[model samples]
Target chain A: MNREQVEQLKQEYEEKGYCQIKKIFDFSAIKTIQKTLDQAKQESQISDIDTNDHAYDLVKYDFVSSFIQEKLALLNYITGKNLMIMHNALFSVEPNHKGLPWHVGVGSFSFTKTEDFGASIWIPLDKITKEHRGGMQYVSTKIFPGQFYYSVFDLHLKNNIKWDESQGDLNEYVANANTIYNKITEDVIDYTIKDGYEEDEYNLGDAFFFNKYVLHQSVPLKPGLHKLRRAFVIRLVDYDTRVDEERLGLFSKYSQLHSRYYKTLPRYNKDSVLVMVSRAVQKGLKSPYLRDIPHVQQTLAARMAA
Target chain B: MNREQVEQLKQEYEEKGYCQIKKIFDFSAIKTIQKTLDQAYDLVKYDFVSSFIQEKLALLNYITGKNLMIMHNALFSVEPNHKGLPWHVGVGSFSFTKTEDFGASIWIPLDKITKEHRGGMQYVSTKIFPGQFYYSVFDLHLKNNIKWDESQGDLNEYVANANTIYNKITEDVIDYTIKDGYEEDEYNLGDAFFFNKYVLHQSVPLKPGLHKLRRAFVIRLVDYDTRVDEERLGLFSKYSQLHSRYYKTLPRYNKDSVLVMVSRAVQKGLKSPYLRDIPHVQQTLAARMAA
Candidate 1:
């Protein structure tokens, strides 16, 4: 893209709360990712954290893990914002799965309590064609900023949902918030029909980036077209992000209702939020900075701005 | 460098009073110019333009086929939303080179220009606004006691007064030149636009959408035959003496004073692009008496 186009797209993202950036990774890089993913599949490797979804950190795979860090650096330099990765996952969906339902992402794991600036980038590993339909659908934040959902989550957390040890597990308290979540999905469906939502048509390596409040869901794969459709998704937060401990504790009590992997979510430590590094350090990893990792400097020196 | 091409350039210089020569320096060569400018600006803020162009005199000589000596130069670092320059001839008081008709000003854009971005130089054709008219306007302003340096180093005041004079007479200038419209010449990174001192010109204002910073270097060149006569020398001496603390090392009035000033400015601590102080006191006195 030309300099003017980059500037214009930045403004576009600001106004509409969503923008598509094309060809972030070239053909060779996309092919490398495909090969790594194929290899992971053949070995029956799955997510270390999430058991219900075909999503993994892919840390054992060198390039996939490193590329995510590089993208984080590039975005930070370009936007003049300090964004740290909260969640980095390589996700795949089998042929008959319905994929995720229409919803906004906000909660203990994302940015509900902190109310910090939040966004995500979804890079399609599979090209979206008539045969594949492997992209995502979204309603822009113009119609409804993600703050609406955050407010809704706050209301339910404060008044509706509560959990005690006698309830046996956090999953039992999930029903109290089910009323609002279902209503939100219904509202998203109505808004999609009324306001007309946008569906991405992505080439391999193209990315759909949007504000966390943007109402969105994945497009299901075309029937019998392919074995699996895969993508890489990353959630990012500004440097100042920290959780509200009470709110996080409330959500943590009921998080297992979605997936058992929710137990691995970052916890509040006063005003600071724990990231992947924080978790790793707790498990006896000594390095403080990502660049301090033995081989990280080789790529960091070439990729990052001084 | 062909004879026919040189003749055509010389003719265009005479007829239009300005013509752009494309690709005088290569794009890669512009980096050397920028590098010198960067160092020169830090070392000597006022004389940086002269310092940067000092090494390029030989190249200018080779291209224009005129043994050029620098009068002075300016670095125009125009930013976004810059409210354009006023239309005026470069004949401030008397022309610094004193060549009047033979001198040339070379403008080189540090960045490539387009009509959309519009950070290039614009000029009125000599066929429309003749050289004689520019000199006549300067003479009229001098006769009317309108001062150029009345505000001392406050260039905004000088430009305002100069623009006042131009605006008063702009209608007649436009009426005479309406047939041949004024032109804005776009430039490439390597291109240079040269025009004599009498050409009426101003900078093209940056338009709304163009956000890139515009930087250009302008150097005034004069032929070897250029000489400062006694009257122009007297004017130079008066201004030089007033600011002697800074201009003391600059050459005092003499027949070859411009060349002397050029050599002196090339040395350390001497200022180039010095403005002649046509003082405010005289302007006020004249205005009071006339009133």
Candidate 2:
């Protein structure tokens, strides 16, 4: 994007929790990623469910990596802080699959220390329009305030909570907080903030970026036209991000409370080595900030020449 | 029931792997149970879903046989055009059922089953692989820790893994054709269909029309010696551990006995929703036989 366009994008992102960026990739590049995703799903052991998190395993080509790197650079420029890709995965919603409810990503972001600034760039493989309606809808940050929910997390973090044999622990806080969160979010979506949300309409290669704290959910597919709605999402965090083990322990505990569906899955412990970084981090990069790393600098330089 | 009738019931159970007992409880008793369930759902922190599986141990133990203990129970309500559950044994179908002893799922519908409301339990009698075979299949799934729900989030890889495991069982151990012509029955309000975990069964969908939701309670009653192997399948143990740490409520497994251990919790301030009128129901059914 041009400097003027980038400036406009950043302003919109600041005003709303999310912004629509037109033509992040051309149709050809989108097709390439789509092909890889299709091939990956065929080979994937986890693709049968509505969502596949391991799509990047086969879909993340060298060119795709370079493209995301450029987006990362733009994100850094947009926020005035060096940002890195935390994780990337593809979501393919099948027919009649119920859309996800309104919620922020802070609970499941896995890293980023506290409710620090983080974002996600969602790029759809196909055009998403009013007729299809298979994209995400986001409530503007002004309408559904982030601080309203963040304050709860902040309070728990500030308190010297015990892990066990105490009245209030991190797990109990998560359970209680989750109960409140579920109630509020459900009410916000259904009654409070209904129609106060904006649904993104995207052409091929158009990308949507939103703050992690931005409340968002999927728009249900319009039956016959939408057999499947697939998109690639890259979760990113600012340079100064750190993970709280106590907070991350909420991952499994929170999931366990949902219902019977989650009881048997492997849970994460305090010592669990969670993957909250992109594929680029695996290819010889030292610092959490991509700007400080020489390899990333060289890659950006090479891309600039192209 | 009388001796001849009970012997016939056993014969039917042995042959078809399941048998429907009519008029086990009266309509009044069914109404009473429904009232408790409705109240339970209202006070329930989690009941948005179609199934709620914490119902009765007190009543289920009587017909399931002497010395039987409650393993688990659920109340399912199905609407029209709802996609019915697939063919599978009840043992390891859920994340919770990780017990060692083989058990039976006693399904009782609140509403009478008819053409309009066909949400009755259907099953294919076990020909060869009965009793412990299905338990082993669940053991494999649980051992690998495969969860097949949408809650795994957009990035979860267990979907394909679950499919692979499902396919492995169907192709290698049991043929898919086994469910070719499953048997179903029309049941009255008080009748119950009892099937062991090995029998391949599923919930029949409501006939596609605007209809009331077909509500039923399924009580999982295990043998008296039922014990939960905590180490191998730890979901229940993990559940207790979490509750013990935070809420200090859920009863931990004794390993030696599941229902007996949970019954202790009932004595120790855990008010059970299970009705303790099993002997009364038994007497009523027996009196009906004589009449």
Candidate 3:
């Protein structure tokens, strides 16, 4: 969009922490990403050293990387912001896929000096429904301030949420979620995509943008069910906002896997890519039916060049 | 400390959240750690980084493959409870010579799950500490949690007090401190360190151990004018648990200077001359008398 439109989107995002534009990419574009994922997965060879779940392994594949790069552009549009770097995430969905618990996106890392501008872009390569398991459910505006807690939930359950156990030093965050939940004086907003809630469906190529603070969870897949839920997550931050290096360090190792490709390219500048893509997407959406697609691409190319 | 001692400490840690043994490392042992840090800094040509900082950084570096092998045995006194991991921290001191605000440290990663004897760790780090300029403060049974709202204090004047931050996206934690003060009903006994009085602090050590949460921070040198008047900070977590990483990352690169170090020595298990020294310190400490 133009500078004016970008500013407006920023306002909406600041207030809601998320803004979604439906059909940003066409079905063909979605198909391209799906085909890319499939080809990359086929070429992937698992090794004994690959400790990540088999279905989720081989995230470094090219198709996954490219798809996430496009999503990062969309993330910039929604946030009206830029980043110094971008990260892409790969998630697997299979039979007996365990659902995630109610949680926020950026938790212990949100200190006052650090901007909460960081957000994730969740895109599905295939149609997703709650009935099939492995769908996303989120709570809006329920992020009360506090640390995440562990004692609030029963750990004995087989379906208990699995945190990044490798990030073992987060003892202070064990009860952070429970603490925030308890401090809430007002009613919390909870929405689940399960049951007859068909509103949560996302066709391939659609992206869901949510504030990192939004409480979200995923559903488990049935046994012997093998469905590939391929999507890329791009972490975006506003231009001129400084990230807490210390806080980012916690997940930097894990998240680095997502950013490796982008980080390697000389043309990739975190802040510029986000800002340029955001403006381009905005411009593309506002002035529809334009015959000069090359001109649009040139405009984006020029900004990126600058 | 033995298995029984660890078991007891684990119970107290679960109940209280923090506990401390006076002079757990003897003066000589601390001196050895200090010397190793000094040498590492000298070798790396970064004088600003200290032994205390190195020790703390090693906790995370060792886990992520950033530094040489950590003296795991030095940590073994704490026991096979959890793989020691690091926590992100922010710290500030009143003394200019020892001032630091943005501090980080390593603690036992899987201690919580191991202590509970569970297969997986169950806490979420992202569900807690959601806003900017917000920090997690812990209060002991008698102590009250400090109010951290920036509006209550002058921002520019109190930036040092107000600007403490920590790592979040990587771990699980619980928020026990409330805005007005500590959650009195929820306060329990255990071992934890307060990295900063103003900023947020939490633990992701997924298991339980005698010292489930071994606290530490990276020390940054602030100018003389900005230093505040604070106590030894034993109640504050920085004094005893500080550590630092050897490599540096300039802002222009958008990456860490220690990335190679992290990948090679920390993650891939490459050994260096530095690895040898870590064990020497551990053996020396093991032979010394405990306070």
Candidate 4:
């Protein structure tokens, strides 16, 4: 049964950008994933001084885990492309908590055939209570397919915006910078995973996947310590996609880390979004004793099968 | 005193494959360089496994340090034709160890008249301790400057050969596969810290630097322990010499790492072994290091 779901998800990914599955694992399986994450963090032995916002300590664990690897392999098998997982985190707010700003992951694109080539999966390790403050918010109707804005956003704000600051604090500065606005109507989408959202509210072990072009931001942590929103984000791309090339060219204007290995997703139209979403859900539900364990086995098995 | 020696060395290098300036640094300066290298290794927090072989970690500390940077600046001022230290390490043996190999520190050619122009520095870090190892030898008399035969010696018994066993090894199996009987010649003159060498050693850094070719390699480590073979490589050319456009027709192989920038250096004669020797030294030295 699990193999059937995995095959279906792979097919959807090949023909579309998103796919979803449900209730593949019980609660105990999710707990195992949390335990593995804790062990990985302990092993990292990250010092307090080095514990800044950008370090993202959970990323290392996520990379090594089987869950993420399986998802990557499935995507690779479906699209015949090399996939990489970037930017993972276990979200929390400290005393000096500044909320993440509203921004699109990769801004508008002109030449990309599929606007939904890249996607992100946000998996909750525990029930995301409102008190946790860092739940995500999506701006619906921002899906602008295939358009890219070169002269849009304010360069000064983009340059000066620090990741550690709150978006409310940056409002005036962002407003004053004469921010350029270009329509990336062909390549954008917005969805949220909060209590009141129409989409499935994320639960413990539940993962919400969305397109990279979505205009999304996180809700600040409410004052209280009862619940923590320990979530991990896994980035995805169709293996046959060339979306990374557009990203590299766009990012090269500002970043030196853009290298030759970056690629773009092949065009599969709106179906790509469906494939990405479905796979994220399937990955979220399918767990062994550990959260990413099934993910690892599936990835390995897929690679061997390939 | 160092300035005069640098000028003389520049002229000598222009005629021969390599020339060295002995005693360029006193004991105190070398010690300071060693100290900085230690600090840099600590800051990077590289494991003993990775640090033992990474030469760039040491060279970055040396080239960017205050004293070495000043000396490089002063040399550039005096030897206008010489391309200064504007390159990183190239042709490293971090993934392979059993065969004779070499590395280079390259600079742009000084000539402006030619479309393709550059120069480089070649170093022979190992092979001096127990005399020359035959398998790790380099020959200076090849018809083409950079070609070599691999079947001349048993590759398995070479020193530092254990270091080359890794996943990233790239074989140039397409070009030179057959072995030939050839005696290895010292490409560069043997000199102490400063006296340079003149022979047909390695020629890659020179080709990349002068021809705007995008390939370079560095010899980072020989064995487990990381030691600083702190040496200065210089590039120079006469000002009035022009380059022929025909040189541009040579094959330009695209490589991922070690692309030498050719924007600097004066253009000079193609037949000038002085100009040619820098690369020859790189090939020769690399062969010896790997051997």
User: Per model, how much of the real contact set is kept?
Assistant: 0.00, 0.00, 0.06, 0.00
lDDT of 1 by residue, A1-306 (tens): 566767766777777777888877777777877787667556643431111245444433234445666666546644556665555456666665557766676642442343456677787777777666746778766544445455445545543334455555454454533433324444435522344578767888788877677877666777566567788766666655453444554554444433442455432222122333343344553443444433333444432323
Question: Can you give the DockQ of every candidate in the order shown?
Answer: 0.01, 0.01, 0.04, 0.01
The CA lDDT at A14 in model 1 is: 72
The order by descending lDDT is 2, 1, 3, 4
Residue A274 of model 3, lDDT score: 25
Encode model 3's per-residue lDDT on A1-306: one tens digit a residue.
Answer: 465655655665566565554565678877775665567557644320111222332233233334444544645555556532233444555555554445555432221123335566676665666566555765434222212222121121101122344634333233333433333211222211123112366666567776555555565555433444555454434434333333333333333433452353223222233233334444543332111233423433222211
Q: Write the per-residue lDDT of candidate 3 for residues B182-271, one digit (tens) a residue.
A: 211111122112112222333333234343343232222221122221222222222112111111222121122222222223333324
Candidate structures ordered by TM-score, highest first:
2, 1, 3, 4
lDDT of 4 at A104: 50
Q: What is the C-alpha lDDT of each candidate?
A: 0.55, 0.56, 0.35, 0.33
lDDT of 4 by residue, A1-306 (tens): 377877886665434333443443357656876786667556543321111232143434333345556455554554455654433545544433444545555432221233335566666665545445455665332222111222133222233232123534333433443222311121212211112222234566556555555555555545564344456555554433332232233344333221211233222222222233234444453422111333333453332222
lDDT of 1 by residue, B158-219 (tens): 43454322324443433333324788877877788877676777787666575566788766
TM-score of each: 0.40, 0.41, 0.34, 0.31
lDDT of 4 by residue, B1-291 (tens): 455665665565444423443443344543443344346122122222222223222322232121110001001111224333321112121111222222222221112212233233333322111112211111111111111124423222321232221111112210111112111222211112121111213222233343333221122222212111111011101100111122333223111111111111112222222211333323333222211
Docking category for candidate 4?
Answer: incorrect
